[PDB]
């Protein structure tokens, strides 16, 4: 399967503190451009954590988005 083919798969994120709110978005549900997908980090065969994580690049917050929330540990 390809990252674009299986772009309807989302992942649940949990906030580090009570103030923050959990996140749940998918590839197709967070991208609206072919080239856009390229930058964010979408070649072809994605792993699992990589696909969802691409969202940070879309929203422009890969710095504190992966730290403030439980993404990569």
From Swiss-Prot:
Role played: Nonenzymatic cofactor regulating the function and conformation of the RNA polymerase and part of the transcription and replication complex. Binds the viral ribonucleocapsid and positions the L polymerase on the template. Acts as a chaperone for newly synthesized free N protein, so-called N(0). Plays a role in virion assembly by acting as a bridge between N and L.
Modified positions (Phosphoserine) in chain numbering: 32-33, 39
Gene Ontology biological-process entries: phosphorylation; viral genome replication; viral transcription
Subcellular location per the Swiss-Prot or TrEMBL entry: Virion; Host cytoplasm
Position of the signal peptide: none
Protein name: Phosphoprotein
GO molecular function: RNA folding chaperone; RNA-directed RNA polymerase activity
Summary of subunit composition and partner proteins: Homodimer. Interacts with the L polymerase; the association of P and L forms the polymerase complex and positions P optimally for encapsidation of newly synthesized genomes with the nucleoprotein. Interacts (via N-terminus) with N(0). Interacts (via C-terminus) with N in ribonucleocapsid (via C-terminus); this interaction allows to package the L polymerase in the virion and positions the polymerase on the template, since P acts as a bridge between N and L.
Principal place of residence: virion
A GO cellular-component term linked to this record: virion component
Keywords for the protein's UniProt record, in alphabetical order: Chaperone, Host cytoplasm, Phosphoprotein, Viral RNA replication, Viral transcription, Virion
Residue ranges, annotated region (Interaction with the Nucleoprotein-RNA and template-binding): 51-71
Family (UniProt): Belongs to the vesiculovirus protein P family.
UniProt remark on domains: The N-terminus is disordered and is involved in binding N(0). The region of interaction with the L polymerase is necessary for transcription. The hinge region is highly variable. The central domain is involved in oligomerization. The C-terminus is basic and essential for binding the N-RNA template.
Reported modifications of this chain: Phosphorylated in the N-terminus by host CK2. Phosphorylation of the phosphoprotein is required for the transcriptional function of the P-L complex.
């Amino acid at each position: 399967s390809d990252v674009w083919s299986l772009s309807k798969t989302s992942m649940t994120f949990q906030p580090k503190k009570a103030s923050l709110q959990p996140l749940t978005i998918s590839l197709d549900e967070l991208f609206s451009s072919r080239g856009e997908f390229i930058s964010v980090g979408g070649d072809g065969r994605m792993s699992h954590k990589e696909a969802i994580l691409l969202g940070l690049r879309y929203k422009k917050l890969y710095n504190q988005a992966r730290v403030k929330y439980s993404l990569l540990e």
